[PDB]
Amino acid sequence: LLNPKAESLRRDAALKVNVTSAEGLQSVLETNLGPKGTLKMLVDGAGNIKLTKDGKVLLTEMQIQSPTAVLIARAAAAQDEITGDGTTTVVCLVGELLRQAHRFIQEGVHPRIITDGFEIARKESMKFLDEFKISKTNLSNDREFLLQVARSSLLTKVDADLTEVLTPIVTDAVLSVYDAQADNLDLHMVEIMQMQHLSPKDTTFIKGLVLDHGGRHPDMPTRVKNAYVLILNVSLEYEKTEVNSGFFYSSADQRDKLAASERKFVDAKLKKIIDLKNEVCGMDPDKGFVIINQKGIDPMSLDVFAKHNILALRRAKRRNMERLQLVTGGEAQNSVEDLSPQILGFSGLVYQETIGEEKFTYVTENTDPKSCTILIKGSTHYALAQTKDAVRDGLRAVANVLKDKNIIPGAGAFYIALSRYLRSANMNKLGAKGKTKTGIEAFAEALLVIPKTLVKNSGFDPLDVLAMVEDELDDAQDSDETRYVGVDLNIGDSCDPTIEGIWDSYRVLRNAITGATGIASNLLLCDELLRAGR
Amino acid sequence: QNPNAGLFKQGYNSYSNADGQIIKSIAAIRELHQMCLTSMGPCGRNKIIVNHLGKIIITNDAATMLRELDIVHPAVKVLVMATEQQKIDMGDGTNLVMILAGELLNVSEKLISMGLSAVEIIQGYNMARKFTLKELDEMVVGEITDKNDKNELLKMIKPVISSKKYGSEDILSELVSEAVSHVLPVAQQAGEIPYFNVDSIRVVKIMGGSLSNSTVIKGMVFNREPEGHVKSLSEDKKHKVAVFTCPLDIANTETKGTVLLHNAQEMLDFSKGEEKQIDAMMKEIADMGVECIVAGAGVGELALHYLNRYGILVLKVPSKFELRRLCRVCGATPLPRLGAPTPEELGLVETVKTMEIGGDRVTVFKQEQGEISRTSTIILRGATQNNLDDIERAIDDGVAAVKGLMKPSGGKLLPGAGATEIELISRITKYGERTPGLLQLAIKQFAVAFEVVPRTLAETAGLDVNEVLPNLYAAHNVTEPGAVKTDHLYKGVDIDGESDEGVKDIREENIYDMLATKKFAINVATEAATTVLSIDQIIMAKK
Amino acid sequence: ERTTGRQAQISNITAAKAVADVIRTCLGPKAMLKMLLDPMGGLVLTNDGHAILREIDVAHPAAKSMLELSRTQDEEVGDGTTTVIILAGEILAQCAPYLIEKNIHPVIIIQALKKALTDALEVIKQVSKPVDVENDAAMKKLIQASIGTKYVIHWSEKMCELALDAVKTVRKDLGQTVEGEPNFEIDIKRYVRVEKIPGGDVLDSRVLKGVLLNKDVVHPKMSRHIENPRVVLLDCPLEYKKGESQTNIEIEKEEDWNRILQIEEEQVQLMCEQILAVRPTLVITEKGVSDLAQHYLLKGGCSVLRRVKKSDNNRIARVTGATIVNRVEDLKESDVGTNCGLFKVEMIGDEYFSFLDNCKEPKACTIMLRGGSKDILNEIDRNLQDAMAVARNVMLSPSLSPGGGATEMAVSVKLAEKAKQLEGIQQWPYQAVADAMECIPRTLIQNAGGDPIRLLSQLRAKHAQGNFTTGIDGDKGKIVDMVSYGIWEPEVIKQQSVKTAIESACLLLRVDDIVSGV
């Protein structure tokens, strides 16, 4: 039953290889789970050092021939397009669920009943999911509670020293861009800037928009408070004919004749701009005037802007100009002849950070900016990649907190309670099936891998911390009140996840149970590995 | 680089069930199974096995071949010991037990492919065996009256002598039935004490002549020469015969009596002493009336000289096993001493002569009426030496079937040559649908295992396998307009090689299988297959 | 290279068993998922039986023959592709020791398969039960077999209405012994052709009788809606006629050049006057229409419609009665726009449409499928064709057969009873057919996880004395009757399953030799 150049695994041998290949990828992301996990370096062919704990980014930067990790890679891709986080946790749930089920395969349990026991446990998990969840109020005074949610996302992807730095940054980034109403939130409206100069501990949040190319003159003012921003589409720089040509004067009389042809369009626009400063903000103190000027600036206007102390800008990005219309409010002016003071916008303190290689400009302190900029600083390249991964994962984690009114406590509070509930639910109810309870127990025993993994990376005994939580849950079942118990990684004993402030998104955990169920089931449903097409 | 695992005990050749050990044990038996498939039946073939003594021996019977073959497989030894049950306890079925037990393992592979446990396979055959044994009592049509008549013995002996050296069954039947009728004593209304014995018939063979020249004589015939001037005795009845265990020589002393040579004067007394003493000892034997001296040991030179003057026939029997059966003939008793032929230890024989058998002069020891003897001798003649070996073995298997004619259902008979094996298939399949449960798989395969007996008879006969099989099915399965099934239940596998077409009733040739052979072979075939199917693991060493 | 003797018969059975080995667990609704490793690094996890076989590359030619026979079965019916290969594969496996070890001639086995095929079709007719083809509620539980386990399960009630409306229109009884009888004479291919309509809701999907066209009015100012439009079909478009070869017009006279420009306007106008001879209210052109012909037909009070496929004009002629004519000057007066309900161009999904639908059946229909996206339309499209294929399977054969391994085992019980009365050499390979008929219900047991030995012994016992109504439930796994849960399939699927399996098993037995070279 074979042809030349064929390799096929039949009977239960393919199930043994698929689980064994899954145990390898499991241990890779096992030590990467939680804030106490490990931070691994991945360099493929580019010499580019990158350190991140995100489960999806690992699989995209590594080529894996194992077919088991291919479907897992498709699972991590579906979680990012929906949940946006928790890719490492889902992989740890799929890996251990195959190990607990593989032990029952040798017992003779058919894999269809194993998959049927998962769907029954998944429907019962959704019932406990609605009972265990906590409804959070839509009020905007929850920023204090948002600080606890922000730390839960940050502590995982960093060394925990940067969490306190990014805690006010990430929290204020979401509330500033999100107006308070039903509405929705847009993460694209929050810009991200990257700089390799300053250390990562010095990073700060930018309320407004920042731009790259500024005007360079020695007399330009460093700080300008409450300045008016004006978008300028005309060219302030000398221009030449479409064909290469130049104006060479042999006398002072020919100098004024040849140079006037180039500055004729410049002076016509330049003299009308400085007249706007005479009509508006001429006398009035505590006001300013700023020019965007997407096009360049000639050295002649630099001396004119220096006499009036006008902040000069040239070579502006077109994408940032559309955001300046929202932040500042000024309309794009194509012709200065039609320029009016109604087109002028309003901005706050504008100060330019002076660095030899690059210069920055801050449009910040605006009345209605309706935009945000997260400035990421770091000394090395991998420090910028890790911080950028934590911000993008942090913004998307908090994004699901405002959209989804339900919140779940973390630190193993959801996993330990669900594993203990499903084990005691089928015993009291006895409404599933007689034989199926074997496969249902495999799912309940696979839910305790996460709390055992969090303490494994910290070096604590997973059997000791598990017995301490069960003793607290038994004390919680005796009392008629509601008390949630969770594992504390720092101290090593149990903790109240509501007081400690460790919280997990409801949508992330809702798709984690259903997602890990279908992916791990399809791997057990494969009897034979087919090699064909060649 | 490649490690080793799975063997935790010691260095050996290890077999486990994960490697298909149950198939390997059947495949090892299948190597020797095909040899017995071509053995049973009148069209069967003979195999050559060279003995360890440098002698080529060819025989049809498998029970003899299994002893001469070197078998290192212990799973085959189970069937070899089961074959000994057919050879010892019975006189027929040695070739049939290897075919049945070998096929029960072949049909069991279909149940193994379905994943059925070996216990339910054994339990299925055990329930199917009781269904077959119950029918074997109803498969008997006629019964031998045990009249022990010469014409009645030809009916039972003919099929037993068959399936070896085909074509001679008519001549060999008259030779065996004549010798058996002589051993069987004359009695009536007594069934308690057995009579016939297997060792009571001693077969001899001498090169020369043909098979038609063979005869049957009452007595024990000796091939040795008379060794002395007296070739044969007279025709007077009741000749006195003395059996001496001690060799013929000068009389010695029970206490010490060691002969030593020292001086030449003693040497002259030793030569002259043996002349006077032997002449004195042999004279006292002739004075008491002993005309024949049977010496189990050697005979001296001076003993033959003095017995020629007294007219005493000298007879030497170097085999001590033949002297024990000789006492039941003449009535003489062996004497460990010499010189005192007590008349209480002397027997009587009517006729002792010397006849030419196959061209050589041999002394015949026989009788007529008085002094009834329980031992008979079958004299054989032929040119081929190898053919005479199988004929003697055919007679031994023929007389052993006479032992099966005793009280334990020795007269009952059933049609053979493929007649019963096909009819039992329809009865077993009838009980398959009748018995509910998982046993239906093993019961149906138990009837298919009986299809090998008619198939081998067709293969050994050169017949097409696609012909005889559907012909036997339509012959034993018919629709009779009535409650009682009628017409021909006797259709077997015909020897063919002649005549016209198809099959025919086996009653035309008066051939049948004895119930004692068939019923006992089924119990041995099931227990032989039960042992193999019950063993899922073995541990051996390099031999 | 070349394989002769009995070795080719071994490879033919091995190749058929190897291909069936893959789909062993691919049979039934409980079929599990397969993983195909591509040489480029791709994987296919789909559990569909016939979707995997097209991606499997095989070497031995007998394995390629099973893929070609499954391709024919895939086009005729949507399901049951793995049923034929597994059934035909087990026939060669049970007859493997008979062909070689038993020394049976292959034609004797092939002739026995022909007698076993005829006896099997008679048993299928006996185990079948009558079904009402005019019952609307009964056809919904049948067509649902091709519906459930798909996205259309929520609309299944509306999915059956769209299927029955198309089948009842194209079916012609014509029952009689004179010219021969096609049973209900359903044609899905030509008449039932569907055009997908974007936008709207799935609940609003209706079956229109007529021809639908996406092209709108081609003129800025023209009547948008015609009460009773009269269709006129034509082939050659409306424009200045030119020769099919190279044409060179050399005129040396001054004022004749202006006359040629007038003929170009008169030639297009002459083509419009020949159309207006019957005074039509609608003009439909297969190819494009020049702007000159648009103004000439505008003064005549008739709509102009260009860009129409040729396959539509064949259906437009039957839903209208306009005769298709090649040259416009040859246009016959027999063209009629009768039996046209509405011309309404009303826009659906930000695109102007054209509706020829009417209130009568012109021996055809056009199914209008609307939904919330194009992906839903393409899903309903293929599902509706498969829903009508199962509906056609029920109409052509007015009987239903029990599923879940009930029909497969019931035939094997009857084959074992007919084997005793055969009395021939073919009896041995004929009993192997019943053993292969028992592998299909054993296949569903091995996929369910139950004990095959314990269940088949109980399953076979319930057919003899239980009126062969006892099948096996897929979801539960306990042996139950098929009358309660109502699991039934049309007979034509069971007929073509055993018919192709014997043809596939005999074809591999007919080839005893394999040679190579051109």
From Swiss-Prot, chain A:
GO terms for molecular function: ATP binding; ATP hydrolysis activity; ATP-dependent protein folding chaperone; unfolded protein binding. One of its GO terms (biological process) is chaperone mediated protein folding independent of cofactor. Pfam families: Cpn60_TCP1. The keyword Phosphoprotein applies. It is found in: Cytoplasm. Transmembrane segments: none annotated. The modification Phosphoserine is found at residue 245. Belongs to the TCP-1 chaperonin family. Molecular chaperone; assists the folding of proteins upon ATP hydrolysis. Known to play a role, in vitro, in the folding of actin and tubulin. In yeast may play a role in mitotic spindle formation. Heterooligomeric complex of about 850 to 900 kDa that forms two stacked rings, 12 to 16 nm in diameter. This is T-complex protein 1 subunit zeta. The lineage of its organism: Eukaryota, Fungi, Dikarya, Ascomycota, Saccharomycotina.
UniProtKB/Swiss-Prot annotation, chain B:
InterPro entries: Chap_CCT_theta (IPR012721), Chaperone_TCP-1 (IPR017998), Chaperonin_TCP-1_CS (IPR002194), Cpn60/GroEL/TCP-1 (IPR002423), GroEL-like_apical_dom_sf (IPR027409), GROEL-like_equatorial_sf (IPR027413), TCP-1-like_intermed_sf (IPR027410). Signal peptide: none annotated. Pfam families: Cpn60_TCP1. GO terms for biological process: chaperone mediated protein folding independent of cofactor; protein folding. GO terms for cellular component: chaperonin-containing T-complex; cytoplasm. There is a cross-link at residue 9 (Glycyl lysine isopeptide (Lys-Gly) (interchain with G-Cter in ubiquitin)). GO terms for molecular function: ATP binding; ATP hydrolysis activity; ATP-dependent protein folding chaperone; unfolded protein binding. It is found in: Cytoplasm. Coiled coil: none annotated. PANTHER family: CHAPERONIN. Belongs to the TCP-1 chaperonin family. Molecular chaperone; assists the folding of proteins upon ATP hydrolysis. Known to play a role, in vitro, in the folding of actin and tubulin. In yeast may play a role in mitotic spindle formation. This is T-complex protein 1 subunit theta. It comes from Saccharomyces cerevisiae (strain ATCC 204508 / S288c) (Baker's yeast). The lineage of its organism: Eukaryota, Fungi, Dikarya, Ascomycota, Saccharomycotina.
UniProtKB/Swiss-Prot annotation, chain C:
Keywords: Acetylation, ATP-binding, Chaperone, Cytoplasm, Disulfide bond, Nucleotide-binding, Phosphoprotein. It is found in: Cytoplasm. InterPro entries: Chap_CCT_gamma, Chaperone_TCP-1, Chaperonin_TCP-1_CS, Cpn60/GroEL/TCP-1, GroEL-like_apical_dom_sf, GROEL-like_equatorial_sf, TCP-1-like_intermed_sf, TCP-1_chaperonin. One of its GO terms (molecular function) is ATP-dependent protein folding chaperone. GO terms for biological process: chaperone mediated protein folding independent of cofactor; protein folding. Disulfide bonds join 359-365. GO terms for cellular component: chaperonin-containing T-complex. Pfam families: Cpn60_TCP1 (PF00118). The modification Phosphoserine is found at residue 245. Belongs to the TCP-1 chaperonin family. NCBIfam families: chap_CCT_gamma, thermosome_alpha, thermosome_beta. Molecular chaperone; assists the folding of proteins upon ATP hydrolysis. Known to play a role, in vitro, in the folding of actin and tubulin. In yeast may play a role in mitotic spindle formation. Heterooligomeric complex of about 850 to 900 kDa that forms two stacked rings, 12 to 16 nm in diameter. This is T-complex protein 1 subunit gamma. The lineage of its organism: Eukaryota, Fungi, Dikarya, Ascomycota, Saccharomycotina.
